[PDB]
């Protein structure tokens, strides 16, 4: 029984070994604690929006959507239908990006490293859509608490359709590399098994629930934008091991493709932000020709909108699990409190139980199957 | 609705057992993976020959900042300080005073590009299209000091990139 | 892709699927980089009349939360926070993988 320190996302891990086995695993976090929640209290809501891109920097628009939904609930407004459809479209695109990241980096840590490039080409393509729609590849800040910042450029939907019609064979090549491979199975099968009761008690969410046979999904049970107007299936695991969660994430990629097709077909016309110039800024032409519009633009970009007092907890089904925000407003344009709940915190808390009586090399597999990004863990 | 990913029961007849035994003993799935990799070897790579080819961009792309001016040649900035107030990172510092002709103009306009997060809030809070975040992205520096822009640097950037800045604003201003 | 027929046959046999149908490199089939001007319709509250703001203000309709049993101030059947969630259906599109 020797204690060894795997030091410098970036993680420090203190583990005691009895030979090959692991006896106690202790993750030491805080190497990426920037103090985001305290810095939010010194900003307005619009100024506090870009922090959420950096929270979970693999699934940006999902954090944007969760923050926007919380602020909408506190403001007592609702976005226009086209804004909601665009939000769900880009949320599914973001889910595809996150699942590519998770699976490819998991396999890379295992030692495969070829699907990483195969799928990072598609990640680059998806990046172009983000760049085209907003002007930034990763931290777009596109989804706003009133809707979306701007409308789609005239050629975006055709390119999204052309990209999404060839993605299935990319997933298929990934599955050829990984799904039926015996080395991959021996690396992932029967590793990190967690029971349904223990997964539920420990605060797990997302695949960590679904992999254990629990039939739960926030997009189905508690739909938020237009997710009740689209049809998709929810893959459910049977053994609660790493292999089942890998299969679940791949099937989520396929279901995200299905939802993307539906969202492309049913995109409605109309405006993109709530037509209430005391929350969403007016158009540049209106600001430059009208007096109320200029006053409202000035006040919104200097002071911001005042949110009625109250506290909410708004959660969404982010690609990593339940991502929530507990937002407390004292009645001003500056949030009084913003607690950020990320599934990675609970997953890394459960890491210690998840790695009982396993090899040293299996800890890497467990960390990979939890898909821990330390920006959301440390905040 | 929901799906099952791994509740497939393998057949226990002699043919399926023999197929599984042949798979174990002759490594069929490993050779299948080898075939997939071999197939991927014989197709064209996705690499572009930088710096001769450049990755695609859009008029909405936001890179290095610039301060623009009117066609007469007189700077658009009126020291309203809305870009300074909206800046999430507090990366803009502005000081103003009446000019010799009484114009409302800035005597100091600094952007700390090491504090900037390139969100574009400044260029959308500007009522006169004075501050823009242009399409340049190749401005890496050998020292920290040269990434601290002042009014002269931003004005030079505007004069340098005005052609395609105006082209991009023309292409994208109907969505704003 | 400007690949010879023999190389296409070799890659298709090695992969087992027809690669030329759906290529992962983008070609002239993408949309043009220069597009016509848009029009971007206005919102629903862009009316000139019967558009008073007091009738369409969400924020002022927010109210402080309703208090029940302020402690400082019959059969009675038991209740639940919500009706029990009804069981999910088994995806009659591809129930099993």
């Amino acid at each position: 029984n020797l204690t060894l320190n795997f030091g410098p996302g970036v993680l420090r891990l203190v583990m005691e070994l009895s030979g090959e086995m692991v006896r106690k695993c202790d993750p030491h976090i805080g190497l990426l604690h920037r103090g985001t929640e305290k810095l939010i209290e010194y900003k307005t809501y619009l100024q506090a929006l870009p922090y959420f891109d950096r929270l979970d920097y693999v699934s940006m628009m999902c954090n944007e959507q969760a923050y926007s939904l919380a602020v909408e609930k506190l403001l007592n407004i609702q976005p226009p239908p086209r804004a909601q459809w665009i939000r769900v479209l880009f949320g599914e695109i973001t889910r595809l990006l996150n699942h590519i990241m998770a699976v490819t980096t998991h396999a890379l840590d295992i030692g495969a490293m070829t699907p990483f490039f195969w799928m990072f080409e598609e990640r680059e393509k998806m990046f172009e859509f983000y760049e085209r729609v907003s002007g930034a590849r990763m931290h777009a800040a596109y989804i706003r608490p009133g809707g979306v910042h701007q409308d789609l450029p005239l050629g975006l939907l055709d390119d999204i359709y052309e990209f999404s019609k060839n993605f299935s064979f990319r997933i298929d090549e990934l599955e050829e590399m990984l799904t039926n491979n015996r080395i991959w199975r021996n690396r992932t099968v029967d590793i990190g098994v967690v029971t349904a009761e223990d997964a539920l008690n420990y605060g797990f969410s997302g695949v960590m629930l679904r992999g254990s046979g629990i039939q739960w999904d926030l997009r189905k049970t508690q739909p938020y934008d237009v997710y009740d107007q689209v049809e998709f299936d929810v893959p459910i695991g049977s053994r609660g091991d790493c292999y089942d969660r890998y299969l679940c994430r791949v099937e989520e990629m396929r279901q995200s493709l299905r939802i993307i097709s539906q969202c492309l077909n049913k995109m409605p016309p109309g405006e993109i932000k709530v037509d209430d110039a005391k929350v969403s800024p007016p158009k540049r032409a209106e600001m430059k020709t009208s007096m109320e519009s200029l006053i409202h633009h000035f006040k919104l970009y200097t002071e911001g909108y005042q949110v009625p007092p109250g506290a909410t907890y708004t959660a969404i089904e982010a690609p990593k699990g339940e991502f929530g925000v507990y937002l407390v407003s004292d009645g001003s344009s500056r949030p009084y409190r913003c607690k950020i709940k990320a599934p990675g915190f609970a997953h890394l808390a459960g890491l210690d139980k998840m790695s009982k009586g396993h090899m040293l090399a299996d800890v890497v597999a467990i960390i990979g199957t939890q898909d821990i990004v330390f920006g959301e863990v440390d905040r | 609705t929901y799906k099952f990913v791994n509740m497939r029961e393998p057949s226990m007849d002699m043919k399926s057992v023999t197929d599984r035994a042949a798979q174990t003993l002759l490594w069929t799935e490993l050779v299948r993976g080898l075939g997939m990799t071999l197939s991927y070897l014989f197709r064209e790579p996705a690499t572009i020959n930088y710096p001769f080819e450049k990755g695609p961009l859009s008029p909405r792309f936001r890179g290095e900042h610039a301060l623009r001016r009117y066609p007469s040649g007189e700077e658009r900035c009126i020291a309203c300080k809305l870009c300074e107030a909206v800046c999430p990172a507090q990366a803009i510092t502005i000081e103003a005073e009446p000019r010799a002709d009484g114009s409302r103009r800035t005597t100091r306009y600094d952007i700390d590009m090491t504090k900037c997060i390139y969100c574009g809030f400044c260029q959308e809070a500007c009522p006169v299209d004075a501050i823009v975040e242009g399409p340049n992205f190749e401005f890496s520096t050998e020292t920290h000091e040269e990434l601290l822009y002042n009014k002269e640097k931003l004005l030079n950037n505007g004069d340098k990139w005005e052609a395609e800045i105006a082209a991009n604003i023309q292409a994208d201003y109907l969505y704003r | 892709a400007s690949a010879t027929r023999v190389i296409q046959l070799l890659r298709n046999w090695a992969s087992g699927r027809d690669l030329q149908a759906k290529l992962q490199l983008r070609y002239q089939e993408i949309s043009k980089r220069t597009q016509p001007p848009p029009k971007l319709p206005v919102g629903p509250s862009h009316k000139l009349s019967n558009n008073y703001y007091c009738t369409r203000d969400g924020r002022r309709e927010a109210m402080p939360p309703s208090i029940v049993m302020s402690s400082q101030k019959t059969e009675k059947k038991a209740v639940t926070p919500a009706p029990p969630i009804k069981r999910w259906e088994l995806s009659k599109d591809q129930p099993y993988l």
Binding site: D151, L152, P153, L154, G155, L156, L157, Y161, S164, K165, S168, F169, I171, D172, E175, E176, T179, N180, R254, Q255, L257, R258, I260, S261, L264, N265, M267, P269 | K15, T18, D19, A22, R32 | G16, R17, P36, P37, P38, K39, L40, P41, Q94, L97
Partner: peptide
């Protein structure tokens, strides 16, 4: 004057998109 023009799906919608897993069998006992 001008009529509304924004990004919309074409008339009749887009073509079907394949999403099911496609793992063929080469075939040998």
């Amino acid at each position: 004057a001008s009529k509304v023009k924004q990004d919309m799906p074409p008339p009749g919608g887009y073509g079907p998109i394949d999403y099911k897993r496609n793992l063929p069998r080469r075939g040998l006992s």
